[PDB]
């Protein structure tokens, strides 16, 4: 098994305490486009983001707070997480169901699908 953890140079705190999530990003509900929901992505766990005293900017001590790796398939992401010794959490991809849509149902004769306005 690949154990490249000793070669990546990551400190121990960010190898064992981390919790990598492997998922396909959900579609932005504000848009009908689905081009972003095609590649598997890998992100770490959110950590403390305190307020900088001088300016109020959101400070952080998490070096891995902006890492978003994109993978073609779930298996590749799982393998990459196993390579670096990161506790991965895979979420199964959710694909919208095929839906039976009929424009003629808008004017049904004995059904509730009859619309009152167009």
């Amino acid at each position: 098994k690949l154990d490249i953890t000793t070669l990546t140079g990551v400190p121990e705190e960010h190898i064992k305490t981390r919790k990598v999530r492997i998922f396909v990003p959900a579609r932005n509900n504000m848009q009908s486009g689905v081009n972003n929901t095609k590649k598997w992505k890998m992100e770490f766990d959110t950590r403390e983001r305190w307020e900088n005293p001088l300016m109020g900017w959101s400070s952080t001590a998490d070096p891995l707070s902006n890492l978003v790796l994109t993978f073609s398939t779930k298996e590749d992401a799982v393998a990459f997480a196993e390579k670096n010794g990161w506790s991965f959490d895979v979420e199964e991809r959710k694909v919208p169901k095929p839906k039976s849509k009929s424009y003629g149902a808008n004017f049904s004769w004995n059904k509730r699908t009859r619309v009152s306005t167009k």
Partner: protein, 35 residues
């Protein structure tokens, strides 16, 4: 030239007189498909 004997309710009054001649309407199976 018989069009000047028609009042506002002439069209609707004639429709009322025809209600007896009209045969029963069909049914969709509910009072309104909203039901």
């Amino acid at each position: 030239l018989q069009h000047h004997e028609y009042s506002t309710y002439t069209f609707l009054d004639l429709n009322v007189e025809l209600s007896k001649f009209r045969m029963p309407q069909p049914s969709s199976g509910r009072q309104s498909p909203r039901h």
